[PDB]
Write a protein that binds this ligand. Sequence first.
Ligand SMILES: [Zn+2]
Ligand SMILES: [Zn+2]
Length: 283
Amino acid sequence: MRNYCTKTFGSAFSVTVVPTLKDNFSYLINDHTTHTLAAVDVNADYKPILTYIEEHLTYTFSTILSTHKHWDHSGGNAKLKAELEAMNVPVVVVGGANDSIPAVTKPVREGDRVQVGDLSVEVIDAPCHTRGHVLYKVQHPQHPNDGVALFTGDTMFIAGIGAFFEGDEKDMCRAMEKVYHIHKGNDYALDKVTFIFPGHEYTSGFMTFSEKTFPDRASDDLAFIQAQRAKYAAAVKTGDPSVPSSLAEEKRQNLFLRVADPAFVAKMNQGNAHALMMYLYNA
Ligand SMILES: [Zn+2]
Ligand SMILES: [Zn+2]
């Protein structure tokens, strides 16, 4: 009952949301300018990626990117790569250097970039959920205003964050600060065209959390959270993914991300940012 959907960035590229396993998302990046394809977070249930390519889409399927080592995000790397070299390739497997990701051929660290066709894929270190978790920031260098796809794995969900399996609240605060300030260089102009593609369909539960926990009942952010919650629920009701949200939206509806805003930390009145993250996590 879970549907695909496609978010498109101008004429430059698109990202297809591919529901996999029970509540996972894998993604297919498609560079329109070179017809180059890349897959993100390929697990044991990878055939739906292939099914999508052979209904909807000569193309070059060059890259697999894994946000983190967990099997529901890396368990299809070796198998899809094999497929893939047999039908074409050279297939590059990108993963965080410190996560020892299955089948990785391009270990990456903060600031690294890899190309997918003409698209740039910039790497952000976000250790917490796993010690080597990364985020992938994807855009077209020649079409920067067409927007950005941000693959956040299990670090950040819509209105949520991942469990701290291999780290702590300080790690998560640091990750939220990195995400919050991605576009500081352009005075956050690109926030509204930066789209968040996370690891799982956990939106419902987190949006209920945001609605209950938002501290300021006089703000229209509450009305916004309520409207967004209903919108995501309706999507999920028809089988549509709740994802993506924009970074502009997350800055309103995601209380964990808002820990990166000193004014919000003050408003919550639960101590400093670390204390606040702990409160929200616990909570
Ligand atoms: Zn995980
Ligand atoms: Zn996961």
